[PDB]
């Protein structure tokens, strides 16, 4: 149930998210007024597999609760399609189950997936990819923009060690998928920490032609350089998939995560980039917010931060709906 603060003295103008948030089955989405879809991914099995600190499986509801009380400035509804819960170490199945909801939702609304670990990215991409295949988009040019301190391009299948898909392999899996479909792997990793990624990961990134900006490269002086790079990245694709790993932010701003950023890139330093991406509300098909771990949050700081970001994206999606 979506509930929150009520200010009767304001009438219909005191509209908040809970006033227009509507829990519904993705199946009935085809019969509703066009809105923006919300999906939860309660899973941190990938986090555990990638040797991180578990807890993100409980994040979806807390982010939704925080979101419920935010003011809503659009006559557009928000459809809560529920949460896909991972059972045990059944990561792969959980990711496809989530992808299933996304695929059904995409024809009627753009979606925001709120999860546990960044393993959510494989679920989101699959949902997006399967939607394209199922709707005749033969060779989609998808721009994947990830704000993460990590490349998360780790190997998931190796005859050198016993590895498996995890919170650190999503984007490698995405590249693999693209290769076999004959699609381009257009990937941008912004805010990457060279102290958090070994030489192997940087080598893999260069090999795959990934465009990345290190945490230390963000500054008022380099904005011109990087926004232009961002612009060109955007110019070369028809669809955008925005994925935010909360561990990209300074530990002070996002304490509730598996690996609090020892350095990070401030929300304000990243804002210009977010604003540029969200301007292309036409191309923005989907997005997700990863790694919120309630177990390490402080007075719900991270939860609210995640809700504000979710809200920023929803506004862009909501404006697109009204645009058409």
Curated annotation (Swiss-Prot):
<feature type="binding site">
    <location>
        <position position="152"/>
    </location>
    <ligand>
        <name>Mn(2+) 1</name>
    </ligand>
</feature>
<keyword id="KW-0464">Manganese</keyword>
<feature type="binding site">
    <location>
        <position position="245"/>
    </location>
    <ligand>
        <name>Mn(2+) 2</name>
    </ligand>
</feature>
<dbReference type="GO" id="GO:0033389">
    <property type="term" value="P:putrescine biosynthetic process from arginine, via agmatine"/>
</dbReference>
<keyword id="KW-0479">Metal-binding</keyword>
<feature type="binding site">
    <location>
        <position position="148"/>
    </location>
    <ligand>
        <name>Mn(2+) 1</name>
    </ligand>
</feature>
<keyword id="KW-0369">Histidine metabolism</keyword>
<dbReference type="GO" id="GO:0019557">
    <property type="term" value="P:L-histidine catabolic process to glutamate and formate"/>
</dbReference>
<dbReference type="GO" id="GO:0008783">
    <property type="term" value="F:agmatinase activity"/>
</dbReference>
<dbReference type="InterPro" id="IPR005923">
    <property type="entry name" value="HutG"/>
</dbReference>
<dbReference type="InterPro" id="IPR020855">
    <property type="entry name" value="Ureohydrolase_Mn_BS"/>
</dbReference>
<keyword id="KW-0378">Hydrolase</keyword>
<feature type="binding site">
    <location>
        <position position="245"/>
    </location>
    <ligand>
        <name>Mn(2+) 1</name>
    </ligand>
</feature>
<feature type="binding site">
    <location>
        <position position="247"/>
    </location>
    <ligand>
        <name>Mn(2+) 2</name>
    </ligand>
</feature>
<comment type="pathway">
    <text>Amino-acid degradation; L-histidine degradation into L-glutamate; L-glutamate from N-formimidoyl-L-glutamate (hydrolase route): step 1/1.</text>
</comment>
<feature type="binding site">
    <location>
        <position position="148"/>
    </location>
    <ligand>
        <name>Mn(2+) 2</name>
    </ligand>
</feature>
<dbReference type="InterPro" id="IPR023696">
    <property type="entry name" value="Ureohydrolase_dom_sf"/>
</dbReference>
<comment type="similarity">
    <text>Belongs to the arginase family.</text>
</comment>
<dbReference type="GO" id="GO:0030145">
    <property type="term" value="F:manganese ion binding"/>
</dbReference>
<protein>
    <recommendedName>
        <fullName>Formimidoylglutamase</fullName>
        <ecNumber>3.5.3.8</ecNumber>
    </recommendedName>
</protein>
<dbReference type="GO" id="GO:0050415">
    <property type="term" value="F:formimidoylglutamase activity"/>
</dbReference>
<dbReference type="InterPro" id="IPR006035">
    <property type="entry name" value="Ureohydrolase"/>
</dbReference>
<comment type="function">
    <text>Catalyzes the conversion of N-formimidoyl-L-glutamate to L-glutamate and formamide.</text>
</comment>
<dbReference type="GO" id="GO:0019556">
    <property type="term" value="P:L-histidine catabolic process to glutamate and formamide"/>
</dbReference>
<feature type="binding site">
    <location>
        <position position="150"/>
    </location>
    <ligand>
        <name>Mn(2+) 2</name>
    </ligand>
</feature>
<feature type="compositionally biased region" description="Basic and acidic residues">
    <location>
        <begin position="2"/>
        <end position="13"/>
    </location>
</feature>
<feature type="binding site">
    <location>
        <position position="118"/>
    </location>
    <ligand>
        <name>Mn(2+) 1</name>
    </ligand>
</feature>
<dbReference type="Pfam" id="PF00491">
    <property type="entry name" value="Arginase"/>
</dbReference>
